[PDB]
Amino acid sequence: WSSKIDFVLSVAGGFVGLGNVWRFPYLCYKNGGGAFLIPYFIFLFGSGLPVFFLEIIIGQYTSEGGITCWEKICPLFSGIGYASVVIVSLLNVYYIVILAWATYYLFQSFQKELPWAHCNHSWNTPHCMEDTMRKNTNFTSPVIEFWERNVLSLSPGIDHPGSLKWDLALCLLLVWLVCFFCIWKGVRSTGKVVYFTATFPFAMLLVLLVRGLTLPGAGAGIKFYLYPDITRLEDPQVWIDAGTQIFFSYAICLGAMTSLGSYNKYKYNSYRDCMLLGCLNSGTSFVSGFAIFSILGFMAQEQGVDIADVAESGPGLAFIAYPKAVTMMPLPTFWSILFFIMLLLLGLDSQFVEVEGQITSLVDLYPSFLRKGYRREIFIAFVCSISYLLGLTMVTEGGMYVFQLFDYYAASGVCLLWVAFFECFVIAWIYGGDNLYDGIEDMIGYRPGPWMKYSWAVITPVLCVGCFIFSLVKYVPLTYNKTYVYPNWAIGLGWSLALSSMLCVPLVIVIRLCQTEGPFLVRVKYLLTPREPNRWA
Ligand SMILES: [Cl-]
Numbered sequence: 001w002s003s004k005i006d007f008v009l010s011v012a013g014g015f016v017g018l019g020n021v022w023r024f025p026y027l028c029y030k031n032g033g034g035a036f037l038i039p040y041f042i043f044l045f046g047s048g049l050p051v052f053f054l055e056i057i058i059g060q061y062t063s064e065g066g067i068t069c070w071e072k073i074c075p076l077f078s079g080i081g082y083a084s085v086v087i088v089s090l091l092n093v094y095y096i097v098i099l100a101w102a103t104y105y106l107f108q109s110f111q112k113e114l115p116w117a118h119c120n121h122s123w124n125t126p127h128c129m130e131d132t133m134r135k136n137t138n139f140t141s142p143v144i145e146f147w148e149r150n151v152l153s154l155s156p157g158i159d160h161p162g163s164l165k166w167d168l169a170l171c172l173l174l175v176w177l178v179c180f181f182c183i184w185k186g187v188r189s190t191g192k193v194v195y196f197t198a199t200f201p202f203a204m205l206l207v208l209l210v211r212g213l214t215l216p217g218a219g220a221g222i223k224f225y226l227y228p229d230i231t232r233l234e235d236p237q238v239w240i241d242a243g244t245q246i247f248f249s250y251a252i253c254l255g256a257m258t259s260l261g262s263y264n265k266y267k268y269n270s271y272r273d274c275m276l277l278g279c280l281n282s283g284t285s286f287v288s289g290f291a292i293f294s295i296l297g298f299m300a301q302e303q304g305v306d307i308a309d310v311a312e313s314g315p316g317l318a319f320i321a322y323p324k325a326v327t328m329m330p331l332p333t334f335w336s337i338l339f340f341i342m343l344l345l346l347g348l349d350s351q352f353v354e355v356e357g358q359i360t361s362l363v364d365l366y367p368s369f370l371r372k373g374y375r376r377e378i379f380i381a382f383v384c385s386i387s388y389l390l391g392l393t394m395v396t397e398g399g400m401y402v403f404q405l406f407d408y409y410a411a412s413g414v415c416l417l418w419v420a421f422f423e424c425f426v427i428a429w430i431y432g433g434d435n436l437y438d439g440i441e442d443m444i445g446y447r448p449g450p451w452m453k454y455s456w457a458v459i460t461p462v463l464c465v466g467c468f469i470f471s472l473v474k475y476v477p478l479t480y481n482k483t484y485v486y487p488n489w490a491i492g493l494g495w496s497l498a499l500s501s502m503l504c505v506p507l508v509i510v511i512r513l514c515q516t517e518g519p520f521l522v523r524v525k526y527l528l529t530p531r532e533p534n535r536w537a
Pocket of ligand 1: 019020024245246249281282285
């Protein structure tokens with residue numbers, strides 16, 4: 001009631017999504033259970049929360065979105081905004097594809113028996129034994145066979161596109177139509193409906209966690225998830241994956257948080273409200289990991305296979321562990337329907353915000369003719385179409401590898417670290433930590449501690465440079481389910497996708513330097529001078 005106003009901030013969002021229920025457990029399973037947690041917490045307490053708070057501060061202080069805020073903070077490094085516009089452009093290409101998969105599952109759960117519960121279907125290989133009789137050449141679980149042969153129909157490689165999955169294509173088209181109709185009119189129920197749309201995911205996750213814990217053999221899965229392997233920390237990929245998972249969950253380095261914080265009033269205590277949201281999101285990820293890694297332990301106990309070889313290392317872990325746990329609950333159809341409705345709600349809640357922010361940024365880029373002369377709706381329908389067609393490369397039979405490439409490069413990997421390092425360097429060494437603290441004192445009412453200052457100045461750039469150096473020196477090529485080796489051209493395409501956003505900052509720097517006149521020192525003096533960031537106040 002009276003205190004719910006604070007919870008009203010939590011009603012905004014940013015505490016639950018597909019980056020906690022889907023991406024975090026799959027990344028943890030790929031990079032080992034316990035060894036993934038230490039870099040995750042290091043990036044959470046050293047770079048994640050500081051960068052989130054910094055983006056909120058920039059948005060509130062400059063009262064501008066992703067692009068225009070850097071025009072007042074440091075014009076020379078304005079391309080940091082543009083890179084974000086690229087990243088959010090790539091994410092919307094593939095982040096919605098997951099929904100399609102879930103949508104397909106939501107269409108497969110409307111029958112008497114779940115299709116992923118028996119081997120007696122037409123999409124099952126001859127070597128398919130039910131998990132109950134698994135313990136009595138190699139045998140495959142019916143859930144994995146349903147995921148790989150019916151939902152995906154996986155191809156031998158990325159160079160085998162095959163044909164378009166008509167069911168998956170129809171589901172993706174339906175999801176895109178829903179997004180367009182929810183953006184072309186901006187139909188957000190809010191009211192009391194937001195209560196349900198915010199409490200249902202936690203209600204379902206609590207039941208999932210209870211079911212996972214009650215499953216026999218979950219102790220081994222929990223031990224695998226918690227106890228870290230020290231040697232696995234030597235691989236830089238664990239650190240990169242943890243940092244990029246933190247950034248993906250916090251939606252930072254995309255310009256969305258700056259735009260969201262621009263709505264906040266100048267005299268607003270956002271320091272506490274950003275730490276609360278970050279802690280809630282991290283706790284949600286940590287708790288949701290326990291359910292999946294207990295289901296994995298139960299599956300490993302019942303099948304007899306190892307915990308690390310019982311599911312898919314790559315994407316789709318949430319489509320193997322959760323559907324398997326659903327078949328254990330009484331009346332599995334109802335629980336499967338609820339779980340996939342929750343997944344659809346979370347995905348749509350994230351996608352609406354991301355696509356609307358991208359459209360707003362692109363309209364504000366040049367509204368003279370994009371939204372004034374020409375009808376704005378024409379831009380809404382077109383962009384999604386461009387995002388829809390580019391998604392059809394992940395609808396084909398061999399589209400899972402393309403989705404993995406996008407998930408590893410388009411909105412993760414070195415691009416997010418690059419953007420975070422540039423933001424922190426611009427704020428701490430160009431704008432100045434004390435200069436920003438002076439504004440923060442007026443914005444929130446008190447001077448923050450040295451944690452944010454030393455994270456922006458030292459910790460985050462050091463982490464984002466060490467990650468680059470160690471990932472380049474110890475270069476491990478990307479693999480799918482630790483069995484498939486991508487071709488050289490696929491790796492080149494992924495690196496080109498990363499560079500499409502990485503090169504925005506240097507190109508904008510070059511353009512800005514070239515458009516100016518005079519000796520180089522005069523140009524660098526003009527372009528590094530803030531353009532009255534707090535003119536709005
Ligand atoms: Cl997370």
